[PDB]
Structure formats: structure tokens, C-alpha cells
């Protein structure tokens, strides 16, 4: 009934706006005010507070909330110490956004009721969208997202042409894909020689700078790739990719928040 989301990052902002969309009370709160300002009309109560101070948690009546969400990115100690305080107020259900693998383990021993990996848990959902959408699968960029789709599609039993810019990731994904390839998706000859033309589903999950993501898809659309699915970064990345011919665009940080905002609504 009473919902509260801490940390207005990309993930924690996509749950405050979605839970408010259907019509549920959301106690949004972030460490500074720059984000809390733009979310003044996107939540039941917008608050500027630091989730590490005890008196700011009590004065906020946070214990009346059966569902607290910690989406503070960047420094992990802000994410951990928060849930450490929440588990002391006997919060019924605390949901936390973890960063790496060890963050999963430490939060599990604190008492974190739920842990969500926006990049990982999204890849397994996209790897289900590509499976139920139909043969030839190819994922470019073995980031956290691009690695969770190569790992999942291979689990179901589908051919995956995994390929990343360097080999450090392609090495650990040698037994995680049908064909692990070390290539740069911006070079034409590396796209042709890889027989990428034969792949109806290309996934550009390259992270970091946008040009590697875009130029890839730009080349893919030239090879008449039937369905190109791309991992975008910011809003302008969506618009430009939409005008290139990107058949599908996925926001791991945003699209996951709307799914979690559906998991908290149907949970009561």
C-alpha cells in the first residue's frame, strides 16, 4: 500500500514515474535536490534526504512503508548502508539495486528481501523476447547486458554469434555461445566476413560511448539485417537510433523500472 523508492537514478526514476502512472503512493527521495526537483510532480511525496542518516529515515515515517526501494547507483556504500538501516526499522520488504556480483552476496546476508540487476535481468528478458519472436542470433558488445543475452540464449539452446570489441570478454564467453568472435562492429569487412548478413537478429549491446553502438547499427541496416536490436544510452540516443532504422531499442535502466513498478503493484 505504502511505497517508497530511494535514489532517483535512471532505474529509481523509472519506478517513481511508473508507480505514479497507474496510481500508487510513492515516497520518492534522492541524496541531493537536482533530481528531486524534476520528480516533484512524479511522486506522492518528493523528499531531499540522505538515506545513511538515521534521523532522516525516522522523520520520513519510512517504517510505515511496507516496500522500500534502494536504487542509489555509483558508490555502493550508499546502497548498502541504506538497506542496513532499513532492515533495522523492520521494513517488511526491502528491494535493492545491486551493481556487481559481490554486491549480490553482501546484500543477501544483510537481509535484502529482493535484489535486481537492471543490466543482467533485462538481458534474460530480451533473450526470451528474441526466442519467442520466431534462428540466426548475433549479439554485438559483450557488456553486462550483451553478456546476459549470450549466456541466456545459449542456455535455452539457440545459436548465438557473440562478438565484442576486444577478447577479454570473448574469452570467458567461449563456451557461452555458438561462436565467440573478436571483432569491431564498425569495420565493414569484419561484418561481412563474419557472415553477419545471415543473421536475422543482431543485438548491439556495446556500452560506453554511443558512436560504437550507432555506427554498428548503421552498418547493420546497410546489410539489410531484418531485425536490429540496439542498447541505447540516453534520450537523444533513442531519437537518432529511431531515424537510422533500428528495429528495436532497449533501455536496461528504464525498461526494468516499469517492470518492477508492475511487480510492486500486483504484490498487494
Amino acid at each position: 500500500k505504502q511505497f517508497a523508492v530511494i535514489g532517483l537514478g535512471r532505474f529509481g526514476g523509472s519506478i517513481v514515474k511508473e508507480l505514479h502512472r497507474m496510481g500508487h503512493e510513492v515516497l520518492a527521495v534522492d541524496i541531493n535536490e537536482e533530481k528531486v526537483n524534476a520528480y516533484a510532480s512524479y511522486a506522492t511525496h518528493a523528499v531531499i534526504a540522505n538515506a545513511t542518516e538515521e534521523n532522516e529515515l525516522l522523520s520520513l515515517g519510512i517504517r510505515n512503508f511496507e516496500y522500500v526501494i534502494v536504487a542509489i547507483g555509483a558508490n555502493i556504500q550508499a546502497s548498502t548502508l541504506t538497506t542496513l538501516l532499513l532492515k533495522e526499522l523492520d521494513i517488511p520488504n526491502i528491494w535493492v539495486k545491486a551493481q556487481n556480483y559481490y554486491h549480490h552476496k553482501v546484500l543477501e546476508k544483510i537481509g535484502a528481501d529482493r535484489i535486481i540487476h537492471p543490466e543482467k535481468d533485462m538481458g534474460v528478458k530480451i533473450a526470451q523476447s528474441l526466442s519467442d519472436e520466431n534462428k540466426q542470433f548475433a549479439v554485438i558488445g559483450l557488456g553486462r547486458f550483451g553478456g546476459s543475452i549470450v549466456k541466456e540464449l545459449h542456455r535455452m539452446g539457440h545459436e548465438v554469434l557473440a562478438v565484442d570489441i576486444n577478447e577479454e570478454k570473448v574469452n570467458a564467453y567461449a563456451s557461452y555461445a555458438t561462436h565467440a568472435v573478436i571483432a569491431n562492429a564498425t569495420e565493414e569487412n569484419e561484418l561481412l566476413s563474419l557472415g553477419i548478413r545471415n543473421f536475422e537478429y543482431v543485438i548491439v549491446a556495446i556500452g560506453a560511448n554511443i558512436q560504437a553502438s550507432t555506427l554498428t547499427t548503421l552498418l547493420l541496416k546497410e546489410l539489410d539485417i531484418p531485425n536490429i536490436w540496439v542498447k541505447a544510452q540516453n534520450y537523444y540516443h533513442h531519437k537518432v537510433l529511431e531515424k537510422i532504422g533500428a528495429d528495436r531499442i532497449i533501455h536496461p535502466e528504464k525498461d526494468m523500472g516499469v517492470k518492477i513498478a508492475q511487480s510492486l503493484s500486483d504484490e498487494n
Partner: protein, 406 residues
Amino acid sequence: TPPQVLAIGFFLTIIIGAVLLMLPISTTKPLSWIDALFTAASATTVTGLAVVDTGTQFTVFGQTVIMGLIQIGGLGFMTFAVLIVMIIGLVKVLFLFSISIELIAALILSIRLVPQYGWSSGLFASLFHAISAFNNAGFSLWPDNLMSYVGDPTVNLVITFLFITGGIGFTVLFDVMKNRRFKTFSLHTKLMLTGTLMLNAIAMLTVFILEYSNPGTLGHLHIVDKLWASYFQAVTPRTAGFNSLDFGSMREGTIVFTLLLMFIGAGSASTASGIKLTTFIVILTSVIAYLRGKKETVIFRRSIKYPIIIKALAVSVTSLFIVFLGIFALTITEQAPFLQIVFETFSAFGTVGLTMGLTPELTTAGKCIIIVIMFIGRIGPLTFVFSFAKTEQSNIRYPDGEVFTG
């Protein structure tokens, strides 16, 4: 193209020269269709084998065509090396410098103790052998193939200087000229001088220890005549082709070491070789570094880069892989002893010239294949494969493949 031209082009000087000698002017006794495409192939490959004896079977015209054909072959290598160097203006120097040291060391220094046979056989036999010595041929006039000059000082001193320097790279030939300093020589040139001399000491020691008591050859020669053979027999397996003593009457161990001593060529630029001396050094010393720990193969405190390693390995296995095919494709063709079948192949592919007495008794079926052996070994296993090898460029990389070999 640079590879194919040397392949099919050098193939024609064999064929055309094979009719330049089978002509009734150059042949006394009938020269069969088989024993004609062979002896003309050996001179152009500067190999040192022959089905028929060159001095008695061929007239003045025959020895002339052989002689001039060898100059063409040494010129062909002279170009072969220059191409390796860079990877027009020199072509004057190299051939002019050829006939220079070929004339001043033959018609002056080799005509000193050979004017015995007169001027019809002393003026020629002193010029014919240097175009064959300096080019590392093995074609001798008199049937004894220089066996008669066991310990004569003029012979063992004049001819050795011809195929040694001719046999070392034109690099170290050209390098010592303008550099001329004890310390300014490049890596390759500094290599040759060391490895050339040092190996000869191991080789004279080997021939002298094993053929010391051997009553056939070297066993009862005088004390001074014993060095003129151990030395010469230690320097002639360098694709030279001259016999100070006979190889068909030596200890089995001596012949073994020669197979290796003749297998390894001498010098890259050189005069003719199956696997140049530089190749052997690199391959071997690169392994010596592995058995210790050095992350790189460094020699003379000037470390060689990785590409030389794979290329040397390629030239290594190719020669063995082919020589083995020869040893295999000859043990069945002709009923001959086994030690001779192995000696013949290593020599045939190295253009070595030393033969244990099987070249005159070669059958026809074993000839057309042997002609290819000297052809392949002379033309070098690398620049010969690049011809009919469709070069294929890979642009995409592939995952790591684990595999053990210990």
C-alpha cells in the same frame, strides 16, 4: 609475378639448356633422352650431380654450355638475394663483380699448378672449375672429381675461397666491402662470419676424428695430407660438390654428420642451399632460449623479431618434409642401399654435389622426381611455394584454442 616468374622462368633455362648439350656437337657417346634433361638441370641448379661424366662424355662445347649455364644460375640467386634484401642499379655490380673474382682467381690463381696438361686442357680446366667453384656447383672436369688433388696446396686453398665466399650471403659479400670495420657489421652479416668459421672447425674435427684410421680414405695419408682432406671434406658439404676423398669408403658415422652438414645450407643470399645456415642458427638457438626462460629470442644483444622465427621454422620443416618424401620415393624405385638413398636425397635437395656413387646408376623413374628435388631445393622451399599458393588474407579473429604438446 615475383614468385611465379622465378618458378617457371628458371624452369626454362633448364629445358633450353637441356637441348644445348644433347646436341651432337657437345656429346660424344649417345646421350639418352633421360641423361640429358638431368645433367643440364644439375649445372643450372649448380647442384653437383650427373648421370654421365662431364669431362669425358662432353666435348669442349658441352663443358662450355655447362659453364655458362652455371653463371646464369648464380646470377639468378644474385637476383634472388637482392629481392630478399629490400623486403636495378646493383645488377651491374653483382655480375661484373662475379666475372671479376671468377677470372682473377681462375685464369691467374688456378692456372698456376694446372698448366701441366698443356694449353688445350690447362687454360680451360683452370677456368671451368671456378665458375663452378665460386657458384658452389660440384661439376669437375677429370672423372676423379678432384679426388686426384688430395693434399695439393694450390687446390685446397684456391677453390675453397671460391665456394665459401660465393657460398656466404652476397650480404656479407657486399657488407664487408663498404663497412670493413670489425664492429659495424649488421646482425645477419655478423652472424654468417661467426657461424661459417665456427662450424667448419666442428666439421674438420668430425671428419678428422672418424676418418683418421679409416684405411680407405685419409687413414694412411701423410700427416700433412691428413689435414687437407679433413678440412676440405668438412667444407665441401656446403653445397660445394668436390671430392678430396671418396664418400663410398668412410665410416658410417661420418656420412651421418654430413647428411646434416649438407642439409643445412650455407648463407641465405649464398650460391645454392636447401636450408640456409641462418635458418638453422635461428631455429636451434630459438629453442635454446625456450629451455631457459628468455621471453624473446635475443642474439648478439640485438633481439630478432618474431616473424623471423615462424619463417625459419617454415623453411625448416619444408626441407625435411620434402627430403623425407624423396627418401621414401627412392627406396622403392631403385634397389639400392639405405645409407646411400638418404645421403643422395639430402644432397639432391641441398644442391650439395657430394654423391656416394649412386648418381650414375640412377634409374629413369627415380630421375624425373630427383630433377624436381634439386629444382625445389635450389629454388628454395619458400619462394617456390609462394607461386602456386593462392594467398588468402584473414580479417576476422577466432576464440582461443587450448592444446598441450609436452
